[PDB]
Amino acid sequence: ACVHHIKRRDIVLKWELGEGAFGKVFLAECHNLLPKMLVAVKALKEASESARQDFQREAELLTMLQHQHIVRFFGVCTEGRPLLMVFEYMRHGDLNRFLRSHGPDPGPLGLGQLLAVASQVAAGMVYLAGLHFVHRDLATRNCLVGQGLVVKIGDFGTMLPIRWMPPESILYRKFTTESDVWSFGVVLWEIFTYGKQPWYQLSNTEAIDCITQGRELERPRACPPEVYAIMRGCWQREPQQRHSIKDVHARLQALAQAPP
């Protein structure tokens, strides 16, 4: 087997963890995978041939990716139904639902914790940029939280995440590394607002207006100005002026070791 295959008979389902557009994610016990262990099992609903292709293709890419801050892929089973993709279990779920339930609405995550969360997401994004891979949908809803506040990028995939997109992506549909930094800036903003929807008051069309008009999201209260500088560096009008995710990660890593 070329991509790793996980036998259905080795997967015992425990309970549902959550729902995506694609279908369902369960907690499972997986027997004989590393020398029983808990795993997350993504199970596809669609069952068609177009979707079965995309699923295989995703498994094909993901077997080759491997990083401390990308969710660990274990294998696939595409012969049979539902189509299964198995990953490491991150018990605290998605980063957006986590921020919202660990903020003011132990107490809220402290500044240093927020900077650790930001730094981990950024680290994942340096791996992707270095691979010349464009995510296109970086958002806190697409990140996962493990025990002990380990955070990893959890998902890689017309519907558009318009509030996270820069002007040039809204207008010209150009997705690059530098549009991913833009989205990262908005991720920073989500982190420091404890999971708020960017431009939440506004409707989608009003959000587009603001983004296209050059209007920046406000500095969150929990957000020190040096972090807001980082946001603004992600939010330059011209893509080539925008900071590298590498610079962005370094700056946050430095900030997280000796916080202001």
Next chain:
Amino acid sequence: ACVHHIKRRDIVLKWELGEGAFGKVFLAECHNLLPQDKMLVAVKALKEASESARQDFQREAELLTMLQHQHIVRFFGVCTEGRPLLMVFEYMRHGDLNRFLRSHGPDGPLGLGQLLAVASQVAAGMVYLAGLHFVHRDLATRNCLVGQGLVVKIGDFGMMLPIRWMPPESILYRKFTTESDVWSFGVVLWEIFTYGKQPWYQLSNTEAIDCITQGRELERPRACPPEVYAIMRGCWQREPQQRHSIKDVHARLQALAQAPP
């Protein structure tokens, strides 16, 4: 193999355990399935040889292989290359729960601590299902099985409407959810405590449907304490959102099983 395949040459049929719409269930010996040689198993043998049926059977197998719980019937494997199509499960010697209830009732019958253990056990199976967001759609005692030690498990997944066990929202607005399954479980509790009596037995399908649709609840069984009948009643709320959680229903039943009134 991805799903466990059971070789026909490893099965010897003993006698028929029962019949269904799908075909037949036999008691069989199975050679080298688990690490002694021979062991007794139940073999679901499919009537139709249709390619559509052969698919569904394949689909069913690749669901059940991933399920596993103390209160769901254990699935061992399948063979779909040949006739009849075979699915192998653990042998539950006392057969289906409905016929069992009717057999160990006033027509010694089953005590309270016993009838409670039976209901607790079904509920456990149903917590597993609800936790998976799996909707059963046909929970009834005819679809549960009883093994040695009064072990009881969910035995069938349905696969024509069981209108009497259905709540108003499933009949009228055609909605099947995890809370339509707690309803049916309520009707299952009623089955257990009436020793397998059909719900609304005097009534026909045309009038049962009217009865439930207007909010007429089932009468309390003789053998049934009113704390128990409360659990049934919590399952029978008109509005789905009001109904009890199977987790809670099960917690109560597991409680009453330790301290029986």
Next chain:
Amino acid sequence: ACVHHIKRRDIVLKWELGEGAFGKVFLAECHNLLPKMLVAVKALKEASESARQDFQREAELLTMLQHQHIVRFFGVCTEGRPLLMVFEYMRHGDLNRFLRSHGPDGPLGLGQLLAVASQVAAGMVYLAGLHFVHRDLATRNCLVGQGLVVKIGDFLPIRWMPPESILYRKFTTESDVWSFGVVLWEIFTYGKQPWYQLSNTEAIDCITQGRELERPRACPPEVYAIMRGCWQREPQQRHSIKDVHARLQALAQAPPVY
């Protein structure tokens, strides 16, 4: 397996090394390939069928071609997307970029320059002995590894082409020596583009009207005699690659130093 298969699952991408027309090359870690190690992964963008069979055939040839100065082919996977070809990792990148970096814009000495040249020529002798015509020999298509190891890394580049290939479209092992001559020039000019002053058109006129490239500042006359030997107008009058390599190897070990 007939061609060696690299299981997708034994690959972990590290980062992109460079881009081609074919797609992308990545640095990866490879799990149990020889009795963890670093490899170069060629990932094809095309995904079609013309290109998918073309990739298989390329792998079927490369599997049998081994030489100390041809980049090592480890294996393939065409069962999946993207199509993968895995090679040895040559840490210093293409030889043109390397020449530009280690040039006067600390420079490599005569003996290093001659080692580079000797290695490219060794790869070219293997090819000519197989009767394989390269057609696109240029420093951009060679790779540099640890220790100044240099190998041929890739298989109209008019500036490297002789008159018969421009005019009459004849490609032979003797047109390959011509190109090697031009490669020698690139090495000794620290990676300069041949005929850089002129444009894509006025260069072909220069090649056609018998004009030879200037002797580079860093180039001993005995090396220029090698180039000039590659650059005879008559294909059969051109020096054999085998004699060119012999000479360059001798001079790399025992140089003229100025």
Next chain:
Amino acid sequence: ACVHHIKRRDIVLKWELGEGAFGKVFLAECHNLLPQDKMLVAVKALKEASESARQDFQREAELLTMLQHQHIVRFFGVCTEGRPLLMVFEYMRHGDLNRFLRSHGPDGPLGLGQLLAVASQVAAGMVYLAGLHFVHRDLATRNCLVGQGLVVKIGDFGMMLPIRWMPPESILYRKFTTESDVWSFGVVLWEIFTYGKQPWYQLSNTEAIDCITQGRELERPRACPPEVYAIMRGCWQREPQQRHSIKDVHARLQALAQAPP
């Protein structure tokens, strides 16, 4: 596998040994083919990727795997799944017999005991063929190979007419038999003793065909004793039934090889 398959990953090409119409022959190393690791082999690499050609190549391989004789080139295996199509044989370092003869002649040359051993060796190969009722149809020194120790073997099976080596019955009445092969062997003897000279070299194809058709025999070579030229003459009878048996031809040559005139 039925025919031995040689994995591409076990072949490393060294350099081209020569060209044919089929494609190319290379010297290669072969890893684990016979019980040491590496050994030198010759690799016939096919130009055409046609499905008809791919079949013929497959057909050729499944003949040659069954052949084996000291004086037929040893076939090791094939690979037909991939491009180019590969057939692997033993390496004969001195190449084809014609170019060898021309190289070790007056243009020290080859002695009599040597030239006889060469002819004896070809004949041995041809006895094997006649004993199998296999008709070669294109025996000529260009189709034999020479290895270390002056070992000589049949190297090619033909696979456009070699009119000069053909007898009148093959030209006129188009008949190819085991006795048209002894004819050609006679012309091969003439090749050996002229050190690789083309038969009827001054003549063109149009007139060679006339020459043989009217019964004009080839002239005796300088280096050739008349007992030897007798053997050639026995091969050149107008009537096939009159011609010598390759077994006898070989017996004579093996005799003269021990006691050279």
Next chain:
Amino acid sequence: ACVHHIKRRDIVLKWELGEGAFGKVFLAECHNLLPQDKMLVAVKALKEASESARQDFQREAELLTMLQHQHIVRFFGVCTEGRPLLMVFEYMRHGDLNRFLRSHGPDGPLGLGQLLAVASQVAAGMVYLAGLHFVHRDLATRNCLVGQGLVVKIGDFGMMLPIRWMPPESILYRKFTTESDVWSFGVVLWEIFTYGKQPWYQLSNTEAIDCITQGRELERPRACPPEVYAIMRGCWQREPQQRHSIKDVHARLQALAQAPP
């Protein structure tokens, strides 16, 4: 041809008459369809190009070609080789009956002799259907059309449940018959006399379904004589066997149309 085919080159689109789920309806000119050259027609142009949809469309055409009645919309032909799929019908200039009723009401409106002629005309169409044992399943004024001369015809055949127009047996026990169609016609009579008001407009789908299921009838409209409301009531019996025959319903309405109260 078996079904009349209308060549695309004979249709010129004028403007869109309306939209449906299927796609769009246009007013078009049609050249040489009936023995003058040009005539106005309605063209149903299908959105989906699916092969399953293309079949259904073909199936629909080969039913409608056999139907013909003064009070069913006249079908002229089809073209299914090309996109979009086309079905051609007679042009009914005043559009659907619901929007017409709303337009010629208190929000001069329509008299009694008029509203009666409208209901008589629908009923006539429905007698034809019942006589063929054809069950409509979705009779409503939105599915009737109005042409010049206040001519009204059934315009659509349905092709998601119109729960408000459905009787209890169709909701509960899922039974569609000719008598579930007289029910719906009763609700159509109510539509006509309320000038196109939605039945149970204050109520939502969840509660309408409860309302009809328990036997709550619709209120008598202002413009509606009680002899007329009797006809509606005859259509609304709980038991299908008790309901009036559309033939009788139509006879009454044709009677009242001559002698209006």
Next chain:
Amino acid sequence: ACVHHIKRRDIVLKWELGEGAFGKVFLAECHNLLPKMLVAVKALKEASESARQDFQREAELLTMLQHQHIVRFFGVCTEGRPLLMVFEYMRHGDLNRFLRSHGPDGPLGLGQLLAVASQVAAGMVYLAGLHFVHRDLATRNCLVGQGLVVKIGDFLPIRWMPPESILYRKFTTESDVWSFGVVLWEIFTYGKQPWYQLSNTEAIDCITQGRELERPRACPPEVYAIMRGCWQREPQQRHSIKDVHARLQALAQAPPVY
């Protein structure tokens, strides 16, 4: 035959009229098409299958669309290469080139300019009444025939696009009026490119920030009121094409003259 077929043999090419992305348009003589005549032949370069079925469908629509101000579709041949679509010949070419030619670089008068505009609007009323959204209405896509007959000739042109189509990708009959407004401007500026001073990017910023195009020198205020009516930011607040056409037709017959 369901769609009208033009037999290849009834066509004789005269010369090329122009080029598109689709391929080429030729002037041809057509033999027995209506009870010899000149036609425009659209010959498709693509020849594939995606494009070959696309061409058939285009013909299947066009066959049913007839209007005095939509270029007349005569027939098709997809049985052969190249794929052919035959239309009426509009001798004066595209309306943009025509406006540039007959402009101050003898000029058309107010009444002629208004006739041109009225004709384009008439074509747009037919389309909007069919609920057909054009998406690319510009003078380059209209044709001029003998007698100043003007018709719509073809089915991101950001400069003709309204804010909702740039920003939110919404294309409606009300975005088509917006484009018609811009067409009015082109007519009255004798074929000038809207926002010609600015570039492809600074124009979209101008559209987005509510900036209207300047009233052309040749443009009476009552015509500018028409444009401005097409150029309301709110789609539902924009004038209907039917009212725009009524007005322009009235003004073409009874102009303000200055």
Next chain:
Amino acid sequence: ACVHHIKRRDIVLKWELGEGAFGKVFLAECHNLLPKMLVAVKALKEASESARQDFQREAELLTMLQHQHIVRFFGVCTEGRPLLMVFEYMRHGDLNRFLRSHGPDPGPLGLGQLLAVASQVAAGMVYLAGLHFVHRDLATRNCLVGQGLVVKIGDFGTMLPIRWMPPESILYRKFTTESDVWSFGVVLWEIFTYGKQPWYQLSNTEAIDCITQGRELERPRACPPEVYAIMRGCWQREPQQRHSIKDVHARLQALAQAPP
């Protein structure tokens, strides 16, 4: 039938007229074609599917072409063997064989006759250029001669006519309208030399040398300088400086009415 079909049964073959690469051209009698007549029948040898396609495609193009100086196409029959294409009969054969047998090697064609031949070929070429169609192989071997010195373009179709090609076609394989004028210039030269091979002394490689070197063919003896001016206008180095075939035709037409 979309392209005109000629029934085999209406074609009676008379004798072979000549040979192409494609096969044979016969003289035939064709019954019921215009209201018996002689026609030339091109018959394909190859018989494959690749070639049967190209044949259909050629017939598809040629049914739409029609000009006084392009050979008249009548129809095709592709169902059956050989594949047949029928054209008008031009009884004097190809223009090259005609020049060679009507020159010094009535007497030779006079200047005015040579200018009529040139003008007719040019006229054919104005039609092609106006259609934006590139011939790629204009040569006298590809023209036909009818009774009364009517001359038409006879053929429209790696092997390269290198002596007729300009540098930019030799080097870059760019074939345009302006490379067709180049070839026309060489056609003029063939006409005024009574059918001589351009660069006949030289080999193909030597011809390429001369063309690439910028060396022009010499003025033929039968050629007045005003005609040689026309040749030179076809032979400019830069394609955009080269004269239009329209100008070239006018100049020759003027020269043929009032010859110098």
